[PDB]
Amino acid sequence: GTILIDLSPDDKEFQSVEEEMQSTVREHRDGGHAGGIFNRYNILKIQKVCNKKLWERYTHRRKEVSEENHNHANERMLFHGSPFVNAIIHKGFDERHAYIGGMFGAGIYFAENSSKSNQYVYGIGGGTGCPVHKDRSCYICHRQLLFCRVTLGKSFLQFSAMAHSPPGHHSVTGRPSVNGLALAEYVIYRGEQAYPEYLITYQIMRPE
Numbered sequence: 001g002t003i004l005i006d007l008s009p010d011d012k013e014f015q016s017v018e019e020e021m022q023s024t025v026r027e028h029r030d031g032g033h034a035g036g037i038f039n040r041y042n043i044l045k046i047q048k049v050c051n052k053k054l055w056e057r058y059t060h061r062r063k064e065v066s067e068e069n070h071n072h073a074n075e076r077m078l079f080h081g082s083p084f085v086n087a088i089i090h091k092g093f094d095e096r097h098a099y100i101g102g103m104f105g106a107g108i109y110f111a112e113n114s115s116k117s118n119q120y121v122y123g124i125g126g127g128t129g130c131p132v133h134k135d136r137s138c139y140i141c142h143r144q145l146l147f148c149r150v151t152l153g154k155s156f157l158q159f160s161a162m163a164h165s166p167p168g169h170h171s172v173t174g175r176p177s178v179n180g181l182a183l184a185e186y187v188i189y190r191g192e193q194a195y196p197e198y199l200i201t202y203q204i205m206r207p208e
């Protein structure tokens, strides 16, 4: 049921998605080990992901959450990187897209920093890097990330350095407590609480 619509680089919507991608790059504490060394990306393509069933699944859950939280879905646009990106855009997020070993338990993880999600494009810890060159810092191979609509509802705040949400909550927020430059990361425990809105195809760029 999924259709991918190419956005033109001239479209304001392409431009605002690219800007969120580029402007949320940060340095990582692994010095690039997982995701590679780069300060910015070469954006190759941005596509809108269109699936009626998946959208209605999302909006249905969004209303349930909203009604449990004074009519406030607390909806964000967040990045997601995964070896399962192609399955996600066709079948939606589910229990198989969960990070079992994540620090906030077995859930589906999202980041404000695009560079954080980039660490997972090739698997946990960057796996063994790109399939062609086995390089976690490959500047040649095409990578994909999702920029997703995520319903957080009432989010449990964790101050830090599939399972269930904490009772009385719809998600968990991992607030950075050491690295002053890190943005928040978020976890949901229901696949229906995220919709993979944009598929972004890119390369990381070697710093000069």
Ligand SMILES: NS(=O)(=O)c1ccc(-c2nc3ccccc3c(=O)[nH]2)cc1
Pocket: 079, 080, 081, 082, 083, 084, 096, 097, 098, 099, 100, 109, 110, 111, 116, 117, 118, 120, 123, 124, 185, 186
């Ligand atoms: N199914 S799996 O290959 O085990 C898997 C998929 C996605 C991720 C992932 N973990 C994150 C953790 C913090 C912030 C953002 C992310 C992210 O974008 N993806 C982890 C594992």
Ligand SMILES: [Zn+2]
Pocket: 130, 131, 132, 133, 134, 135, 138, 139, 140, 141
């Ligand atoms: Zn490569």
